[PDB]
Structure formats: C-alpha cells, structure tokens
Design a protein around this ligand. Structure first.
Ligand code: HEM
Ligand SMILES: *[C@@H]1O[C@H](CO)[C@@H](O)[C@H](O)[C@H]1NC(C)=O
Ligand SMILES: *[C@@H]1O[C@H](CO)[C@@H](O)[C@H](O)[C@@H]1O
Ligand SMILES: [Ca+2]
Ligand SMILES: [Ca+2]
Ligand SMILES: [Mg+2]
Length: 336
C-alpha cells in the first residue's frame, strides 16, 4: 500500500490521482455531494457509453464499438447526435473538462463519477472501481442503445449480444430507482420513475408492478404507459420487462430486499464497467470510493394499495411478504 500526498492511504500509487478527482467532482459536478440530476445523468451516460459494444457487428465484418472507452465524451460530436443521447450535452461537457484537467482517461472518469455519484444517494452499494482504460477511442456505431419502445425480445437481444443474460438486464435496471424522464413527456418534466428518486431502493421494482391506473400528464407520451399514482411516470419497456415471462421472476425477487438488489446491481455494473477491456490489465482502485449513507426504510406498497393491486407475473414463486403503507394515494413531486 502507499500513502498519497494528501495523506490518504491506498493499495496502488495509480489510485492517488483519484482522490483529487473525488474532491473536484463532489464540490463542483455534484454541487456539494448531492444526489440530484447530475447523478442520474451520469448514470445514463455510463450505460450509453459502455453498451456501444457489439461482438455480432464485429462478426459481420464491422467495427462493433469499444465499450466503456469514454467514446461518448471523446466523440460527443457523433454520439450525442444519437436519438438515445438527448439531454446529455451539459453533462458531457462538464466531465470533459474534469478528465482534461486531471489527466485521467474519459473511460475511467465516467466509471469513477458513477461510483462517486451513487455514494451520495442513500442505499447505494459501493461500486467497484478499476482504472487503466486507454484514452483513445473510435466513435460508437449507432443503434446499439436499447430504447423505451423496443420489444422485450429486441432488448434481451441487444443486451445478450453485449454479454448480459436476461437476469442481468433486470439487475442493471435497478438504476431506475434513482430516475426521472425529461424527454419522453416534456409536459411533466422530471416526473420520477419510482416514489424515491433520491433513494437507491426496491421501490422501482414494486411500483412498476402495480396496476397502471393513472395518466400523470395532459397526454400519454411516446413509450409511456399508465402509472400507479399522480406524478409517477411509467416507461413502456420497464412495464413489459416487469411482466414478461423471460424476466418476471428476477424482477419480483428484486422487490423485498434492498441488500440483494444492491449486490446484484453492483455485480452487473462491474461486468458493464469492463466491456471492451480485459480486467486483468486494469488496476483496482475500489478503496477510493466513499460509502453511501444507510437506507433503513422497509420496502413498501404505497398509498393504501395492497398485494391485490400487484400484477404478479412470476409462476415459480409467490409474491414476497412486504409492508403496506396507509393511504391515500401519493402525488410525486418532480425529481431535483
Ligand atoms: C432496458 C434498458 C433501458 C432502457 C430502454 C432505458 C431507457 C431510459 C429512458 C428513455 C430514460 C428517460 C430519459 C429522459 O427522457 O430523460 C431513462 C432514464 C434513466 N436511465 Fe434508463 N434505460 C435502460 C437501462 C438503464 C440502465 C442499465 C441504466 C444505468 C445503469 C439506466 C439509468 C438511467 C437513469 C438514472 C435515468 C434517469 C435520468 C434522469 O433522471 O435524468 N437505465 N432510461
Ligand atoms: C483524451 O483525449 C482527448 C481528445 O479526445 C484530449 O483532449 C485529452 O486531453 C486526452 N486525455 C488524456 C488524459 O490523454
Ligand atoms: C401530484 O402532486 C405533486 C405535488 O405534491 C405534482 O408534482 C404532481 O404532478 C401531481 O399533481
Ligand atoms: Ca463507448
Ligand atoms: Ca428509489
Ligand atoms: Mg384496490
């Protein structure tokens, strides 16, 4: 182990630079270690950056993309033109300057920012952080990012090609527990995807399974479905994934334990963090990531709804026993 200039101990000298980056991101990018829009955006970026990897394209004699190579920043001119990459400009620009001023690769920076961002959100696991990804990259081919109107088959197909099994697709989606939408229905800008957009918990999995009864906006936008209460937005792909036979059971098993959800997501994320790379070539700097405060709230079916309102879709196991909150129906405020 080594002791960096500032006095912090670490297992590798290549981790030292990150303590400075941590200080920078928390102060400025995160505006005081907060769990607001900046974290959710970075979470969109890390997914959109890494999934630009496709062994099948490579098989068809084409460039399949370099994965988590930081290409979304390096080639933002091309990638930010992608339909799926709307609303990310200001975030890409802010990160570009951080990577430049610290001499760290874009690929590594995006991964670091994700782990650090999540620590500011109660309930989040301590994500793994590897460093050593090259700073060079080619722009990602278009159409490698799954969209909200895609069919479950198409989604599982794209993710499978990248290396994720259906279970892992459900695990990765835990990120929607700290999410809102800004571009699917602008009339309800920043409507949350679950009742706790600042808490990494199982509410997302529970709420997407409740019967859709409400139209939160003046109209139902593109790829929008009815949600269980005012202020909450339900994306079509989440709705289908929650109920599809190929993913239903994993989804349901994610409702009762925050601990299990965290562990699974963390594992899935570690796998996604190295798409396009060989982890044996990277250096482990996980010890730099701070812990997130604990979330002790129990998973609950909100607003007087009961298990009778849950559209059970898994045939092999009963819906688990969880708490029920008293009414009335909540009305979600926009995410910050
Ligand atoms: C089946 C794959 C997925 C689809 C189809 C999908 C689609 C979307 C869409 C359309 C939005 C709304 C963006 C907007 O209009 O502002 C969204 C938001 C979000 N997504 Fe995904 N997503 C998927 C997987 C994931 C994964 C794996 C992550 C990252 C680990 C993630 C993280 C986020 C976050 C945090 C937001 C919130 C952004 C914000 O509040 O500004 N999603 N997702
Ligand atoms: C990474 O590449 C960009 C150009 O894409 C450059 O401006 C930046 O300084 C490079 N960073 C490092 C750490 O080499
Ligand atoms: C529920 O009420 C909230 C405020 O408490 C709104 O944001 C939402 O659109 C709905 O009226
Ligand atoms: Ca990429
Ligand atoms: Ca949540
Ligand atoms: Mg009822």
């Amino acid at each position: 182990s080594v002791t960096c200039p500032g006095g912090q101990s670490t297992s590798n000298s290549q981790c030292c630079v990150w303590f400075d980056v941590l200080d920078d991101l928390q102060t400025n990018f995160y505006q005081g270690s907060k769990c607001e829009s900046p974290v959710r955006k970075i979470l969109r970026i890390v997914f959109h950056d890494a999934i630009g990897f496709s062994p099948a394209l490579t098989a068809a004699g084409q460039f399949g993309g370099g994965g988590a190579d930081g290409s979304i920043i390096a080639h933002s001119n091309i990638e930010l033109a992608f339909p799926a990459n709307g609303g990310l400009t200001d975030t890409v620009e802010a990160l570009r300057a951080v990577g430049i001023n610290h001499g760290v690769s874009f690929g590594d920076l995006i991964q670091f920012a994700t782990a650090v961002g999540m620590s500011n959100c109660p309930g989040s696991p301590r994500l793994e952080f590897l460093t050593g990804r090259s700073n060079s990259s080619q722009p990602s081919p278009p159409s490698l990012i799954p969209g909200p109107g895609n069919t479950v088959t198409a989604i599982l197909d794209r993710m499978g090609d990248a290396g994720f099994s259906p279970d892992e697709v459900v695990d990765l989606l835990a990120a929607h527990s700290l999410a809102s939408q800004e571009g699917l229905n602008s009339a309800i800008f920043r409507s949350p995807l679950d009742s706790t957009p600042q808490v990494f918990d199982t509410q997302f999995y529970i709420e997407t399974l409740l019967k859709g009864t409400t139209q939160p906006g003046p109209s139902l936008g593109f790829a929008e479905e009815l949600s269980p209460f005012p202020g909450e937005f339900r994306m079509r792909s989440d709705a289908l994934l929650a109920r599809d036979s190929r993913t239903a059971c994993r989804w349901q098993s994610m409702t009762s334990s925050n601990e299990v959800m965290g562990q699974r997501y963390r594992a899935a994320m570690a796998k996604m963090s190295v798409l396009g790379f060989d982890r044996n070539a990277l250096t482990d700097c996980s010890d730099v990531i701070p812990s997130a405060v604990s979330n002790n709230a129990a998973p609950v079916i909100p607003g007087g709804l009961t298990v009778d309102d849950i559209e059970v879709s898994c045939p092999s196991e009963p819906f688990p026993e969880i708490a029920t909150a008293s009414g009335p129906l909540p009305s979600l405020a926009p995410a910050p």
